[PDB]
Every structure is written in structure tokens, then in C-alpha cells.
Amino acid sequence: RVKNIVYLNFDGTITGAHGKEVISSPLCEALSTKATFDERMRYKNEYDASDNKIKITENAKNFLQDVNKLHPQVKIVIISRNHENYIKALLEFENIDHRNIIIYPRGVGNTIGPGEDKYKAVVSHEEKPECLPGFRLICDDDEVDGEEMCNGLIHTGRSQLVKFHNEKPGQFKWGEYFKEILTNCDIAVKEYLN
Ligand SMILES: [Mg+2]
Incomplete structure (x- = not known):
């Protein structure tokens, strides 16, 4: 059972830069095809030397780590037009566990991915049989x-x-x-204390 879900946009919400100015950047394009931890971690040096605007923000990092400790009473869903391997790379560079975070990202090549239609991504997630009514948080830097x-x-x-x-x-x-x-979320807080 999943009763409480946190839906987060990635670019400009967890990071400091709007998606449009990041999606075509050399670093995002390079990381798009890096399908393993070993291949992604080679980019950490380039990431750390980047403009601070493209990094995961300090406060968003602390939020993700804190909400990760409320699993499984709260689940995190990232919905994004960006590449899955870029999202996973940045989470890994900041030492944020993503093993229980669900990522709905861009498709690969000519295939369309679930993060490209945010309305449809939310409908699809809610229609999973384990998802139940409860608390919902939505954060997006693009109001539309x-x-x-x-x-x-x-x-x-x-x-x-x-x-x-x-x-x-x-x-x-x-x-x-x-x-x-x-x-x-009562059961969340009861767990987080005792
Ligand atoms: Mg955004």
C-alpha cells in the first residue's frame, strides 16, 4: 500500500535551473546514455565544477534525504522531461539514495517516455493498484x-x-x-519519532 505521495519536478525544482537551459547542455547530453553507476560517476568532477545553478540545491538535497527516511509511509515520484540517467547521476553525485524513488523521465530516442506528459504520468501512477487516497504534495517551477x-x-x-x-x-x-x-501524515510522524 502507498497512501502518501510526493510528486516533484526535477529541473528548476530540485535543481536551480529551468529545464530548457539544461536539457541541451553538453553535460546533460553526455550523461543521457550513461546507464551504470560506474559510467555516471566519471562526470562528478565536471558536475562539481559547473555553474551552481545546475546543481541540486542544498535545501532540496536535505528534503530528499529527510523524506527518504519516511519510506515506506511516504513515496517520492520524480516526473521530468529530462533523461533518466542525468537524474540518477545528479542524485548519485549528491549521495542521495534513489533506490526507492520512482523516476518517470524522457523516452529514449524516438520512443516517448512517461515524464513527457505530466498529466498522464500522474494518472498512470495513481491507477497503480497499490496507490490509495491520502496526502499529495506537488512541486513544479513551471506553473502550467x-x-x-x-x-x-x-x-x-x-x-x-x-x-x-x-x-x-x-x-x-x-x-x-x-x-x-x-x-x-500521522503514521509518517509516528515512525519518524519512535
Ligand atoms: Mg522544471
């Missing part, structure tokens, strides 16, 4: 795409308790959102 994810919840009758946050990159209030999870 955020509303699309909200619309997915509405469409599935999963919009009973939704916190939706849309901020400019670098302005997300991650500590407050953690408090929102704790104040709205």
Missing part, C-alpha cells in the same frame, strides 16, 4: 506543468488533500513542505 499534475489528481479522484507549490528556482520552501508532510 504543476497545474497539469494537479489536473491528473483531480481526474483520478485523488485530489482530497493536495499541497501544490509553484516557486521560482531556488525559492522553494522545503522545510515548510516537510512540516506539511509531518502535520498531514
